[PDB]
Design a protein around this nucleic acid. Structure first.
Ligand SMILES: [K+]
Ligand SMILES: [Mg+2]
Ligand SMILES: [Mg+2]
Ligand SMILES: [Mg+2]
Ligand SMILES: [Mg+2]
Ligand SMILES: [Mg+2]
Ligand SMILES: [Mg+2]
Ligand SMILES: [Mg+2]
Ligand SMILES: [Mg+2]
Ligand SMILES: [Mg+2]
Ligand SMILES: [Mg+2]
Ligand SMILES: [Mg+2]
Ligand SMILES: [Mg+2]
Ligand SMILES: [Mg+2]
Ligand SMILES: [Mg+2]
Ligand SMILES: [Mg+2]
Ligand SMILES: [Mg+2]
Lengths: 103, 70, 7, 88, 271, 66, 129
RNA sequence: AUGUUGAUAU
RNA sequence: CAAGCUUGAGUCUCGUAGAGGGGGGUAGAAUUCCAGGUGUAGCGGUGAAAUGCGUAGAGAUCUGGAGGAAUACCGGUGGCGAAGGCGGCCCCCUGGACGAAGACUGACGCUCAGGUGCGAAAGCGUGGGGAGCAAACAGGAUUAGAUACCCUGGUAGUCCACGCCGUAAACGAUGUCGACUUGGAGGUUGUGCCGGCGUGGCUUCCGGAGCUAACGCGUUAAGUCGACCGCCUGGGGA
């Protein structure tokens, strides 16, 4: 299993779904012999520029240790979810439990 | 470049600070560069030539410091 | 030309 | 490249020892594993010409080791090409 | 698979076949078959109303499901089949309740693939949803014009529609023509392109191949006598007229759309 | 000049650390040359990748005018 | 690849002399040592010594006279690409006898002088002058 | 901005 | 011919840097076009003009939309690749290089006519795409003329898929492999010992002996040698 750092940022109107989305996405990971190494609801931040005619969004980090197939499934979930205005899935070399500079 | 003219600032000073900001960001140079297309071979040749100038300066610059002219 | 010079 | 595990499995199968990595049989077996693995890659990636230069190095290297093994020991060669399933 | 025939005879020299080995070699599913006898392009007055139609191979009609209204219930693709009645291939699908139907075969669909229709269906090729539920930017085919009517747009081999925008009750579509067209967002569409995109690469190769398809010869107007066509007449090859139809309408540029009823739904003409 | 990343002994520059990354961009948003900051070549490459990742996530701006 | 160790020894000497090196060290071999003897006995090099078992290293100590190197020239003659063998009557006189040709005869490696005396021809390894 | 040419031999 | 050996060559382990390659996705800046608002007589262009665009409302300015192509800064006589070449960011598949510790095989190597593969740009075929640019072409200039340079436009093409072509000042105008032979200053990428002191790889500039017709080359040789290949034999004709 490979380690992925997953940032996604959410439409600030759908800020109240973010708890639900997190537990849904972690269930997809942990229901495939996956793990959640980090999980940081950064909350609503000011965007550096407008995305999708928005000036803020609700960020969520989560480092993960999944198989490839569920992370591909996770990407398609981010793709077909108008809540999630942007996402970035990066490979990391190792698991990352240390807390981010945001917190 | 984006100058806020601060309170209790002469315009002439603020204009000079705008010129500074533009010359720092290198806006005019960027525009003049992009006015016409430079072939990659042309781009590479000038990059090479600039490096050689700076090098052949640096070595020969030290030579001038040592030797007396009179 | 000039049907064949320098002046 | 071949995984640490899959490498080690071939070393055990073809080596006289678990540490016998050098032997012609092990070398040829490892090349055969990776050549066979890459067939799937090049089926998809027909214009991956840079990677294929690596494949054709493996193919070449393997040919040289088999031509070595054959003249060194014809029996060991005959056993190897049978197991790996090579024409020659 | 596009395959050039070998020139063993002059009629074969230029033939290019599109050979799909996936297609069922057997007979079609008989409960979804109907007779469709031929017209000759003749209407109920017995008069030729469309020229150049006649003969060709006898054909059974396959009842294709353009509506795709059996929503909720999954179906598996049994087999692709050749349909004589259209350029696309069709797929016999088996619903989990044991109903069979034909559908237009999308690009990439194969035996064993799962499809489903409805609001709740997944966004994957073969699945049919209301276009309100489909993402903007999606490529779709078999698009309804009125809700419930059945798919009418992008049905031919290799065709599709882009959902370019969604504005309240309407989606905007980019049609194959290049036309930009509003349609109600309750109109269903199936995801993906229509399959058999090689269809256009076929080369019939000889006259007889057109005759097999029930196309009779076109006689040029300029080949005729003045009594027969505006272009008729001349001692030798003469013309000296603006090109027109057999009925005298100009036939190189003159527009013939006249439908103020539907003008509202055209965002941009194909141009 | 001098390189802060060699000094600290950092492994990755990290796109999330905006406070750091802001020191290596101009007022315009542009990545500063290593010749100016005195960063080591190895870290300059990591820093560029970090800034570009941050710009994508809209943690940094691409330019001063959005 | 390395395909003439003798030419390599001659070259190590030639180069080492030009570079005013005191000694030059190559990988050893029987034939190299045999040549080193002839160069020692004829007084071109000063001394040599082999050292090691698995990988022996020959080590020639070079001579210089009045500043200058003693080996004026040293040319491979027979080489892998073209083997030169001479009969006793046709043995080469290097520098009109002031230099040597090292000859591998059936009775071992020796000078062309020694080969003439022994009545043998053989493979002409090198000239030295 | 543009802005041509100078017979043969010696 | 037989048996060895480990130093050439190769295998394994751990790690490192990289625009190496193939596939897919995505981001922001800008151009153009489309629609609309504000606004009014110019805009654009040049050496100077004119063609062109503009009161049917351009240019400018703001909002929204579409689409293609390329990735500013970072960026470096930096890196990677056999060469051609490779530059946003992300993931997937994948090739090579290097280093440190050993262990392993035991000359398995070098070169390579013919052969095979890869091979910029232009070009060709089939199907897509087409913002910007632009052979052809048109008009405007300039001029003795101007089938040009300059200007306004503009088609192939440049982009994608697959196939073909097989050439370039495809250059370091320098074949590959190996050994050896004073130095200096850098760059880049490992590593060991404790900012210093070593030790590997690749690379830029200078320069010593030597070499060279000279220019220059100079441990990345055009020096000193070996192996194999390619090629030259006056200019033209070709
Ligand atoms: K004349
Ligand atoms: Mg390998
Ligand atoms: Mg007709
Ligand atoms: Mg016709
Ligand atoms: Mg007639
Ligand atoms: Mg008439
Ligand atoms: Mg006539
Ligand atoms: Mg006439
Ligand atoms: Mg003149
Ligand atoms: Mg050849
Ligand atoms: Mg091309
Ligand atoms: Mg073409
Ligand atoms: Mg085309
Ligand atoms: Mg022009
Ligand atoms: Mg040539
Ligand atoms: Mg050349
Ligand atoms: Mg030099």
């Amino acid at each position: 299993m490979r380690h992925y750092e997953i940032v996604f940022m959410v439409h600030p109107d759908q800020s109240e779904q973010v708890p639900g989305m997190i537990e849904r996405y972690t269930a997809a990971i942990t229901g495939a012999e996956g793990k959640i190494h980090r999980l940081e609801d950064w909350g609503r931040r000011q965007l550096a520029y407008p995305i999708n005619k928005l000036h803020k969004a609700h960020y969520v980090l989560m480092n993960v240790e999944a198989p490839q197939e569920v992370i591909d499934e996770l990407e398609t979930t981010f793709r077909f979810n108008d809540a999630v205005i942007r996402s970035m899935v990066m490979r990391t070399k190792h698991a990352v439990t240390e807390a981010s500079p945001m917190v | 470049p984006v100058i806020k003219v601060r309170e209790n600032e002469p315009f002439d000073v603020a204009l000079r600070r705008f010129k500074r900001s533009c010359e720092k960001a290198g806006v005019l140079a960027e525009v003049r560069r992009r006015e016409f297309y430079e072939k990659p071979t042309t781009e590479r040749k000038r990059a090479k030539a600039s490096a050689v100038k700076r090098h052949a300066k640096k070595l020969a610059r030290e030579n001038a410091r040592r030797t007396r002219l009179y | 030309x000039x049907a064949x010079x320098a002046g | 490249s071949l995984s640490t595990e899959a490498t080690a499995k071939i070393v055990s199968e073809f080596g006289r020892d678990a540490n016998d990595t050098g032997s012609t049989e092990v070398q040829v077996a490892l090349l055969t594993a990776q050549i066979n693995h890459l067939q799937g890659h090049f089926a998809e990636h027909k214009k991956d010409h840079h990677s294929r230069r690596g494949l054709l190095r493996m193919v070449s290297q393997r040919r040289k080791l088999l031509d070595y093994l054959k003249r060194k020991d014809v029996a060991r060669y005959t056993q190897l090409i049978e197991r790996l399933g090579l024409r020659r | 698979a596009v395959v050039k025939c070998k020139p063993t005879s002059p009629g074969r020299r230029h033939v290019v076949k599109v050979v799909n080995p996936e297609l069922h070699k057997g007979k079609p599913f008989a409960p979804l078959l109907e007779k469709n006898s031929k017209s000759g392009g003749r209407n109920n007055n017995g008069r030729i109303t469309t020229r150049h139609i006649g003969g060709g191979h006898k054909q059974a009609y396959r009842i294709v499901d353009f509506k795709r209204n059996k929503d909720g219930i999954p179906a598996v693709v049994e087999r692709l089949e050749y349909d004589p009645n259209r350029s696309a291939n069709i797929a016999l699908v088996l619903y989990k309740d044991g109903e069979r139907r034909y559908i237009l075969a999308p690009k990439g669909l194969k035996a064993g693939d799962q499809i489903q229709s409805g609001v709740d269906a997944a966004i994957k090729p073969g699945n049919t949803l209301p276009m309100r539920n489909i993402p903007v930017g999606s490529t779709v085919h078999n698009v309804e014009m009125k809700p419930g009517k059945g798919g009418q747009l992008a049905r031919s081999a290799g065709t599709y529609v882009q959902i370019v925008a969604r504005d309240g009750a309407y989606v905007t579509l980019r049609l194959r023509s290049g036309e930009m067209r509003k349609v109600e967002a309750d109109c269903r569409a199936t995801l993906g392109e229509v399959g058999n995109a090689e269809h256009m690469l076929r080369v019939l190769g000889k006259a007889g191949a057109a005759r097999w398809r029930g196309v009779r010869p076109t006689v040029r107007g300029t080949a005729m006598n003045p009594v027969d066509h505006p272009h008729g007449g001349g001692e030798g090859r003469n013309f000296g007229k603006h090109p027109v139809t057999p009925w005298g309408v100009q036939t190189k540029g003159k527009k013939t759309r006249s439908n103020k009823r539907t003008d509202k739904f055209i965002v941009r003409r194909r141009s | 000049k001098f390189c802060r990343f060699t000094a600290e002994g950092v492994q990755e520059i990290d796109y999330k650390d905006i406070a750091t990354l802001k020191n290596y961009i101009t007022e315009s948003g542009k990545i500063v040359p290593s010749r100016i900051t005195g960063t080591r070549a190895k870290y300059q490459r990591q820093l560029a990748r970090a800034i570009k990742r941050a710009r994508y996530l809209s943690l940094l701006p691409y330019t001063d005018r959005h | 690849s390395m395909q003439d160790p003798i030419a390599d020894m001659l070259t190590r000497i030639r180069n080492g002399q030009a570079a005013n090196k005191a000694a030059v060290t190559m990988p050893s071999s029987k034939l190299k040592v045999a040549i080193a003897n002839v160069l020692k006995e004829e007084g071109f090099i000063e001394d040599f010594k082999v050292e090691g078992d698995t990988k022996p290293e020959l080590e020639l100590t070079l001579k210089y006279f009045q500043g200058k190197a003693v080996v004026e020239s040293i040319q491979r003659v027979s080489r892998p690409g073209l083997r030169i063998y001479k009969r006793k009557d046709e043995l080469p006189k290097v520098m009109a006898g002031l230099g040597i040709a090292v000859v591998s005869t059936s009775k071992g490696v020796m000078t062309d002088r020694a080969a003439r005396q022994a009545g043998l021809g053989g493979e002409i390894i090198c000239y030295v002058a």
